[PDB]
Design a protein around this ligand. Structure first.
Ligand code: HEM
Ligand code: HEM
Ligand code: HEM
Ligand code: HEM
Lengths: 151, 149, 149, 147
């Protein structure tokens, strides 16, 4: 398992943690709106994700689809959990390992989970505007990689 | 589910008490989650059989799997509290939450095992701001989940 | 002071802009404080004369005296934002805050040096939620301090 | 000495838990609790009235209201620093600068502990715990070491 070594480096990287908290401050202004935007981007660039999310029904309906709405809001509270864990390696490891359990049971591989990075970039461009920087995407990719190592 | 949502969202007092007590609990999310789980297993050791994967739950924070669960549980509560101004949001978030609990064969009655543990946790963490109305507000919110199971 | 307090507390738009922007800044109060001080000293190096005790301010976080000041500054902002619903509270909290600033011979005009640094900090931390009106809200709040000096 | 004491606070999990739990209660009503703490100080240590002469009659006082609210945000700052030794040290040392200048000794500053015990007892009710008082006395001792 690579989870512990990757988590060590996330916790020790202060500038990267700052990028995560700064960009999270913007992403979390509108938890529902941003969660829905992220999911819409996932379905755009990985349409294969529709099969894993079939229970949600017609995902093209956005906020008008109550199942998609409930999922999209709930996803953002897992991101909040991760951000709140960034200063304590044992805390980050145990919350990432907990999170991974259901994803493993759904047969979501490290490669499939990494499909979320592009969607994160696109959502960050929409939320950051003229102040967007790829350094925020690299920061989120490092955090995503901790989860990938658990899958 | 709709009737249960309507009871919570229809009372400004229930919503206020949920928000004010959550504010207190949020002073230490991790300690809150651990305390709630400890109260669950002390008052209701029968529920330990749902948590086989977590191992020795008596160990508390020292058990990393239990710690991960205890912290993660609080983020569902955070979401519920943030949902109180929009009945349709509370409904869709609770229905989403319920999916995995239904898959674990956790009935509404079983889920309600948390009510008395939550009352004890509120008394322990709120000092003189505790009242039975605050316990009642939490029972009403848990009732929404129970109706969805 | 009374007219400056009324301009802020009487405006739902100013208050909403202060609350939303503070919400964003509160994701990282330490980084916010350090970024504000960096913008102050870069855009308004004339103000460095007031901060002799801090030593080499260009060092940022690695300068522990600067770090302690930057963090502490944000708790005054927190108090101001928590005062916005109550003109009597904003008044007495700002007048309290002003006492040491008056003692350090910081005039209203001098204190105003913070305004453009605050605007740049907001641009760099709010993304697309930044607006001219958000900057204006902060200029109005700073105006309350300026009136008290 | 600030470093030694700060390290022990940051390392003591049980003590930090008592500080955060009790702070969750004290901070529900920042204004009311701040005023209660100050009133207890003036009752117990009459000499404190003299140090606070700028506030006027502290026996309806807006200057005292402003001070007592503001005090609570320094406590919030300390509580927010409990997991990072270097953060706790730097915020304590910053806080101390004005208190040193006003000639408030470590012994005088410790006059706050009893008033904090009374405030805790009033706010915590049946869940008041003497161990919580000891935890706050330990945090106050970090500040005293800086004076
Ligand atoms: C930032 C990345 C992600 C976060 C924060 C996230 C978070 C969550 C959360 C909190 C849940 C609810 C709890 C649970 O059942 O596990 C969930 C469910 C789910 N996740 Fe993810 N996840 C992410 C990425 C993905 C990706 C990339 C996929 C597949 C392509 C995926 C597939 C699912 C599925 C199928 C469910 C159950 C959905 C339902 O039927 O309601 N997840 N995820
Ligand atoms: C305040 C009440 C509760 C909250 C907020 C809560 C929240 C959560 C959350 C967020 C998860 C992780 C996502 C998931 O897999 O569904 C979870 C998992 C779980 N819940 Fe709950 N739940 C509560 C009460 C209960 C009760 C009373 C039981 C048992 C009777 C229960 C049994 C479980 C189990 C077995 C898991 C999976 C544990 C694991 O292996 O990691 N839940 N719950
Ligand atoms: C957003 C605007 C500002 C806020 C919220 C702020 C807040 C604070 C706070 C809370 C303190 C510590 C308590 C005290 O000693 O008074 C402080 C100290 C200080 N303030 Fe400000 N202030 C601001 C702007 C300014 C500006 C523009 C100047 C100079 C032109 C200034 C000069 C200082 C100095 C010199 C100190 C003492 C620094 C030290 O030696 O540690 N302040 N301020
Ligand atoms: C929990 C303990 C204490 C906290 C959190 C606290 C916090 C504060 C804060 C935030 C200020 C305003 C910033 C500044 O000027 O330094 C202040 C001012 C003051 N402190 Fe303290 N302090 C405490 C204990 C004491 C004690 C025990 C005394 C004296 C017996 C004292 C004497 C003062 C005085 C005289 C001022 C200036 C008051 C004014 O004219 O408005 N402090 N303190």
């Amino acid at each position: 398992s690579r989870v512990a070594e990757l988590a060590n480096a996330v916790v020790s990287n202060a500038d990267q943690k700052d990028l995560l908290r700064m960009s999270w401050g913007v992403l979390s202004v509108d938890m529902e709106g941003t969660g829905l935007m992220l999911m819409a981007n996932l379905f755009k660039t990985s349409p294969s994700a529709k099969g894993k999310f079939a229970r949600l029904g017609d995902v093209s309906a956005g906020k008008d689809n109550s199942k998609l709405r409930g999922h999209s809001i709930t996803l953002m509270y897992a991101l909040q959990n991760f951000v709140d864990a960034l200063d304590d390696v044992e805390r980050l490891k145990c919350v990432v390992e907990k999170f991974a359990v259901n994803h493993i049971n759904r047969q979501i591989s490290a490669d499939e989970f990494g499909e979320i990075v592009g969607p994160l970039r696109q959502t960050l461009k929409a939320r950051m505007g003229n102040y967007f920087d790829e350094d925020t995407v690299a920061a989120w990719a490092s955090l995503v990689a901790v989860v990938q190592a658990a899958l | 589910v709709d009737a249960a949502v309507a009871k919570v969202c229809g009372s400004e007092a229930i919503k206020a008490n949920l928000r004010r007590s959550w504010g207190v609990l949020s002073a230490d999310i991790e300690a809150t989650g651990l305390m709630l789980m400890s109260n669950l297993f002390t008052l209701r050791p029968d529920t330990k059989t749902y948590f086989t994967r977590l191992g020795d739950v008596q160990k508390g924070k020292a058990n990393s799997k239990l710690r991960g669960h205890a912290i993660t549980l609080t983020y569902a509560l955070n979401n519920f509290v943030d949902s109180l101004d929009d009945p349709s949001r509370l409904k869709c978030v609770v229905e989403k939450f319920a999916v995995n609990h239904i898959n674990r064969k956790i009935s509404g009655d079983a889920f309600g095992a948390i009510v008395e543990p939550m009352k004890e946790t509120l008394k322990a963490r709120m000092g003189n701001y505790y009242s039975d109305d605050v316990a009642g507000a939490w029972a009403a919110l848990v009732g929404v989940v129970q109706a969805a199971l």
